[PDB]
Amino acid sequence: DSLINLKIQKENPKVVNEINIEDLSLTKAAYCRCWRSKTFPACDGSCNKHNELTGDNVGPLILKKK
C-alpha cells in the first residue's frame, strides 16, 4: 500500500464529500474514485489516463436518479 491521493486538498486530513441525493440536478452523474480529476469530486475522465499509463482499472461511481 502507498498514497492514492497525491495533490487533492492535502491540508484536509480526511477528504470526505457529502452528496444530497434529493438535489441531484442531472439524471446521471459521475463521481471520481481516482483522485486524479481536475474537477474532483466529479469524474473528468482522468481515470482513463491513469489506467492507460499504469495498467490500473479504476473508474467512477455513477449516480442515477428517477
State yes or no: residue 41 binds ligand FES (CB under 6 A).
no
> Whole-number minimum distance, CB 13 to ligand FES, in Å?
14
Structural Rg of the chain based on CA atoms: 13
64 is catalytic: no
Q: How far apart are CA 1 and CA 39, in angstroms?
A: 25
Q: How far is CA 57 from the centre of its chain?
A: 13
Identity of the residue, 44 or 59, whose beta carbon is nearer to a second copy in the bound complex: 59
Residues that bind ligand FES (CB under 6 A): 32-34, 36-37, 43-47, 59-60
